[PDB]
Design a protein around this ligand. Structure first.
Ligand SMILES: NCC1(Cc2ccc(Cl)cc2)CCN(c2ncnc3[nH]ccc23)CC1
Ligand SMILES: [Cl-]
Lengths: 337, 20
């Protein structure tokens, strides 16, 4: 059963969680090719692993910048989790290491680019196109949540398309192993659950709200709560009001009403029956969950590829030297990395 | 239209993560 599968995956996860891999490569073992994106305290690059010729995505984080932004513990969470997980829609760490200046995490490369890019260009996805992606997220969150992990940054920017048109849930910067409630204000304004905004302790139910936002945005082409400034967005999210496009199916609207539910006693994914309330909803009635997990379903969209290491599905970012100081920075802070 | 209001907004590009 699913329960069985998950139990065993947890045994696998806990062993790596309790004894994390460390220092499993070195920078000189990789050829850096192109920046695939940026964040506040680093960048992700396409790299080639020279001894194998494999391409990977290499996340390069500036330790001093991580410290300035108070993201030390969050970054230690990310690496510790990602080295421990294993799931068809995640990119676990193939290698990790650090030097005087930076932290490095090497992951499976997703050549199709961000879902965001394709969503914005095409405008909106059909309900079937949306459901295909949504299904993969439902399973991933089932997996993560069963490991007592909370993900906390679902959005199209953070869903990478692979060569077969399936997705990888990336950007584990805010992911945290927590059994009770937690309090950190983090995520992306459009995707924040009202509990987070209202400075309440919160739990994994915020990931199910975020799912509601994502399915809406995918199917509408814009999110349920938007404005020019965050503060106006926060006002809309808390208010208790959402409007659906007239082209939204009846089933879709009902699912979204149950995901975008301010009342935790009523929010799908948070009830007694957990994720099955989502899996067994009518909007998912055509979804064969095993076929999705097995990646046997035909993707409704598969990206264009010239070949290995092709990056045409990514935007261009300014390239900047990777400089390695002669002095070790922030040694104690990142001792366990 | 809501679409037009979105496209005319300042938040159609990549959205940054927030944290306290
Ligand atoms: N959301 C896209 C962003 C943004 C990002 C996040 C953090 C930093 Cl420090 C820098 C940039 C992360 C995933 N990445 C990516 N691309 C391709 N294959 C991948 N495999 C794992 C991650 C990844 C592309 C870039
Ligand atoms: Cl990432």
């Amino acid at each position: 059963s699913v329960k069985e599968f998950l139990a065993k995956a947890k045994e696998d996860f806990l062993k790596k969680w309790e004894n994390p891999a460390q220092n499993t490569a070195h920078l000189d073992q990789f050829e850096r090719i192109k920046t695939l994106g940026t964040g506040s305290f680093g960048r992700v690059m396409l790299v080639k692993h020279m001894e194998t010729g494999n391409h990977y995505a290499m996340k390069i984080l500036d330790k001093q910048k991580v410290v300035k932004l108070k993201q030390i513990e969050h970054t230690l969470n990310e690496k510790r989790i990602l080295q421990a997980v294993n799931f068809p829609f995640l990119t676990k760490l193939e290698f990790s290491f650090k030097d005087n200046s930076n932290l490095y995490m090497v992951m499976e490369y997703a050549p199709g680019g961000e879902m965001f890019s394709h969503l914005r260009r095409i405008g909106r996805f059909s309900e079937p196109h949306a459901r295909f992606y949504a299904a993969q997220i439902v399973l991933t969150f089932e997996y993560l949540h069963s490991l007592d992990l909370i993900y906390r940054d679902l959005k199209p920017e953070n869903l990478m398309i692979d060569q077969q048109g399936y997705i990888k849930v990336t950007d584990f910067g805010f992911a945290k192993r927590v059994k009770g409630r937690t309090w950190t204000l983090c995520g992306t304004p459009e995707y924040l659950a009202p509990e987070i905004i209202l400075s309440k302790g919160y739990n994994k139910a915020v990931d199910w709200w975020a799912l509601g936002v994502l399915i809406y945005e995918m199917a509408a082409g814009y999110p349920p709560f938007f404005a020019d400034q965050p503060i106006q967005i926060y006002e809309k999210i808390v208010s208790g009001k959402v409007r659906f496009p007239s082209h939204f199916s009846s089933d879709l609207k009902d699912l979204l009403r149950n995901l975008l539910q301010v009342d935790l006693t009523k929010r799908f994914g948070n009830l007694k029956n957990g994720v099955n309330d989502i899996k067994n909803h009518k909007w998912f009635a055509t979804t064969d969950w095993i076929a999705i997990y097995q990646r046997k379903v035909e993707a409704p969209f598969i990206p264009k590829f010239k070949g290995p290491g092709d990056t045409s599905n990514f935007d261009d970012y300014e390239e900047e030297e990777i400089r390695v100081s002669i002095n070790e920075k922030c040694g104690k802070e990142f001792s366990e990395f | 239209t809501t679409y037009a209001d979105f496209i005319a907004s300042g938040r159609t590009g990549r959205r940054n993560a927030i944290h306290d």
